[PDB]
C-alpha cells in the first residue's frame, strides 16, 4: 500500500462517519509495529473502542498495547475534553453574573464547534512536544481536524479581535498563539505529516472526499493520500444480481473519481466479511484480497394517521436524509393527502405533491450578509475576516435553509411538510434565545425523525443527535435505518455475511434508541426515479 510506504512522524486519517478510519488506523499501527516502529496510537473518537478491539482498556496515559509490541495507544476523549474545555471558561464567572447568563454562555459552547476548537488544543499539544518523537517512529490519529478549525486558529484577528455565532470557543485556547502556529505549521509540513483521506467507492461519498481535499490542501496540506475502503470484489458479482448491481455502480464511480482526487496516491481495500475485532482480522484488511423490523411503509401509515403534520427528517451528512424525505412525501401524496416536500439538494419533479427547491449557498449567503451589518458594523478588516469564518461554519448553512424552510412551515396546519435536513438541538437552543420552537416541541404537530445507517459509528452519531434535539425538548418520533442489506435479496456469500454483520445495530436501535423504526434496504440501483422510490417504502397491510 503506498499510504504505508514512508509515513512521517505524523498520520492523520480522516473521513465521514463510519468510512472506517479507526480500523485502518489500528491496522496500520500493527503493520508498522511489526516492521520494528515505535507506535503511538491516539484514539480521539467521543465513546473509543480501540482498547476493546485490542482487548484492553485504554486511558487518557500512554499505555502498551501488549497483545502487539512496539505499539502503544493514548485515548482523547472529546466529550470529556470539551466539558473541561467549557468549565475552564465558565467556572470563573460562575458566581459573579448572574445564573441565566453562566447558563446562555454555557449552551454558546456546547456545539460542535467547542468540541472540533479543544480537539485542536488537545492536537496541537502532542505536535508541539518534541519529546515523543524520541520514544516514538510515528503517532497515529483516527481523526482529523478540519479545514475551518485550521483557518480559525491562523487568522491574525483570532488573537487581536474580541466579537460581542460559535465564536465563544476562542477565548478557551490557554496556550500561546505560537503553538497553534508551531502545530499548524506541523500539520503542513509533508515531511512530518501525511493526510490520509478515507472514503467508499459511491459517487456521493467522493464528491464529500474531493471537496475535504481541496479545503485541506489549499490550506497547506499537500500531503494526502486516498484509501478507498470496503471495496467489493468482483470475485463476488457472479451468481447474484444484487452483488453484480453494487460491483458496477463502484466500477462506475472508481473509473469516474472526481478530478481532484485522480492525481491523489490511491490504495483500495476490500470490503471485510465480518467486522474486525481483533489483530488476526485488522491486519487482513491490508491485502489484496430476517430482522423483525417493519417497512417505511408501515412509519408513513402512522405518519399519515393525524393527515396534517410537520414532517423533519435529520440526521449525518449521506445517511439518505433527501431520499427517505422523497419517498415519504411520495408515499403521503399517493395515499391522498397535499404534500408539500422540501429540498436542499437537487433531485426531479401526482398533482398532490408540490417540491419547493432552495439553493442552501444563496441562502447562506444572505445570512452572512445580514449579519454582515449588524455585527461586522465596528469590527476591522480583521476581525470581520474572523467573522466570516465563523459564518463558514457547518451550521450557518443550517440555520440558513432552516430559515428558508420556516417560509413554508405555515402549511403545516392544512398538510403535510416534509424536510430533508434540520438545525442540531444546540442550535436550536441558540435561535430559540434570539423560530418556531413551539412547534418543533409539539408531538402532534411535529414529527422528527432520525435516519441512520446499520453500522456501528452511524448509530452512535445519531443517538447523540438525538440527545442534543432532546436537550432542546425534541424528541424524535421515530428512527429509520437505511442501506440495508439484511432485507436485501442477495444470494451474494459476502452480502449474506455482511447483512448478518448489522443485526446487534439493528436490535440497539429497536431496544435502546427509538420508539419506533423503519428498515429500508439497500436497493442496488439509485432511488433516482420515483419507481424506484416507491421501491424503498415495501408494503403495509392495512388493519384495523
Ligand atoms: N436505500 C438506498 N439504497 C441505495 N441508495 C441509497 C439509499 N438511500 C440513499 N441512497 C443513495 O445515497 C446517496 C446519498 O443519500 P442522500 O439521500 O442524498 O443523502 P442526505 O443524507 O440527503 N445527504 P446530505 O443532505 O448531503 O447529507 C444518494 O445518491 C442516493 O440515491
Ligand atoms: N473494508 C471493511 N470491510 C468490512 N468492515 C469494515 C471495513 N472498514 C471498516 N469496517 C467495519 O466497520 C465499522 C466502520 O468503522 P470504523 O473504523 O470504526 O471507523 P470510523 O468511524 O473511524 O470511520 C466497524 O464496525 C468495522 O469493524
Ligand atoms: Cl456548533
Ligand atoms: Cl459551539
Ligand atoms: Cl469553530
Ligand atoms: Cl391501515
Ligand atoms: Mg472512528
Ligand atoms: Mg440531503
Not at 238 to 250: F, G, K, Q, S
Not at 444 to 469: I, Y
Request: hydrophobic share 40%; charged share 20%.
Amino acid at each position: 500500500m503506498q499510504f504505508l510506504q514512508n509515513i512521517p512522524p505524523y498520520l492523520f486519517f480522516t473521513g465521514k462517519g463510519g468510512v472506517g478510519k479507526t480500523s485502518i488506523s489500528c491496522a496500520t499501527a500493527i503493520r508498522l509495529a511489526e516492521q520494528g516502529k515505535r507506535v503511538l496510537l491516539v484514539s480521539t473518537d467521543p465513546a473509543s473502542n480501540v482498547g476493546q478491539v485490542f482487548s484492553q482498556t485504554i486511558g487518557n496515559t500512554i499505555q502498551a498495547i501488549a497483545s502487539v509490541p512496539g505499539l502503544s495507544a493514548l485515548e482523547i476523549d472529546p466529550q470529556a475534553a470539551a466539558q473541561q474545555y467549557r468549565a475552564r471558561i465558565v467556572d470563573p464567572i460562575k458566581g459573579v453574573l448572574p445564573d441565566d447568563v453562566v447558563s446562555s454562555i454555557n449552551e454558546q459552547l456546547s456545539g460542535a464547534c467547542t468540541t472540533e476548537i479543544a480537539a485542536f488544543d488537545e492536537f496541537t499539544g502532542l505536535l508541539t512536544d518534541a519529546s515523543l518523537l524520541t520514544r516514538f517512529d510515528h503517532i497515529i490519529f483516527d481523526t482529523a481536524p478540519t479545514g475551518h478549525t485550521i483557518r480559525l486558529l491562523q487568522l491574525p484577528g483570532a488573537w487581536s479581535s474580541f466579537i460581542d455565532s460559535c465564536l465563544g470557543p476562542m477565548a478557551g485556547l490557554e496556550k500561546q498563539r505560537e503553538q497553534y502556529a508551531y502545530a499548524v505549521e506541523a500539520l503542513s509540513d509533508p515531511k512530518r505529516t501525511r493526510l490520509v483521506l478515507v472514503a467508499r467507492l459511491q459517487k456521493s461519498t467522493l464528491q464529500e472526499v474531493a471537496r475535504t481535499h481541496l479545503e485541506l490542501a489549499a490550506i497547506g496540506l499537500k500531503n494526502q493520500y486516498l484509501v478507498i475502503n470496503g471495496v467489493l470484489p468482483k470475485t463476488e458479482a457472479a451468481n447474484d444480481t444484487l452483488a453484480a448491481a453494487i460491483w458496477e455502480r463502484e466500477q462506475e464511480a472508481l473509473a469516474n473519481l472526481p478530478a481532484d482526487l485522480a492525481g491523489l496516491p490511491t490504495d483500495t481495500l476490500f470490503l471485510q466479511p465480518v467486522n474486525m475485532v481483533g489483530v488476526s482480522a485488522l491486519s487482513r484488511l491490508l491485502s489484496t484480497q430476517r430482522p423483525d423490523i417493519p417497512s417505511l411503509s408501515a412509519l408513513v401509515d402512522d405518519i399519515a394517521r393525524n393527515e396534517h403534520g410537520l414532517i423533519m427528517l435529520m440526521g449525518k451528512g449521506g445517511v439518505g436524509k433527501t431520499t427517505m424525505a422523497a419517498a415519504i412525501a411520495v408515499r403521503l401524496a399517493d395515499m391522498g393527502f397535499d404534500v408539500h416536500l422540501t429540498t436542499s439538494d437537487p433531485a426531479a419533479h401526482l398533482n398532490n405533491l408540490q417540491v419547493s427547491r432552495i439553493d442552501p449557498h444563496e441562502e447562506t449567503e444572505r445570512y452572512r450578509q445580514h449579519v454582515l451589518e449588524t455585527k461586522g458594523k465596528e469590527l476591522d478588516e480583521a476581525g470581520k475576516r474572523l467573522l466570516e469564518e465563523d459564518l463558514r461554519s457547518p451550521c450557518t448553512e443550517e440555520i440558513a435553509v432552516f430559515q428558508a424552510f420556516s417560509r413554508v412551515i405555515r402549511e403545516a396546519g392544512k398538510r403535510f411538510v416534509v424536510m430533508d435536513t434540520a438545525p442540531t438541538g444546540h442550535t436550536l437552543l441558540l435561535l430559540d434565545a434570539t423560530t418556531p420552537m413551539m412547534l418543533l416541541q409539539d408531538p402532534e404537530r411535529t414529527k422528527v425523525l432520525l435516519v441512520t445507517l446499520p453500522e456501528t459509528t452511524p448509530v452512535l452519531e445519531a443517538a447523540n443527535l438525538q440527545a442534543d434535539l432532546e436537550r432542546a425538548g425534541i424528541h424524535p418520533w421515530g428512527w429509520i435505518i437505511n442501506n440495508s442489506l439484511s432485507i436485501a435479496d442477495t444470494r451474494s456469500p459476502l452480502l449474506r455475511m455482511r447483512a448478518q454483520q448489522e443485526l446487534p445495530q439493528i436490535e440497539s436501535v429497536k431496544r435502546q434508541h427509538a420508539s419506533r423504526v423503519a428498515l429500508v434496504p439497500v436497493l442496488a440501483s439509485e432511488p433516482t426515479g420515483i419507481d424506484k422510490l416507491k421501491q424503498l417504502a415495501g408494503h403495509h397491510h392495512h388493519h384495523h
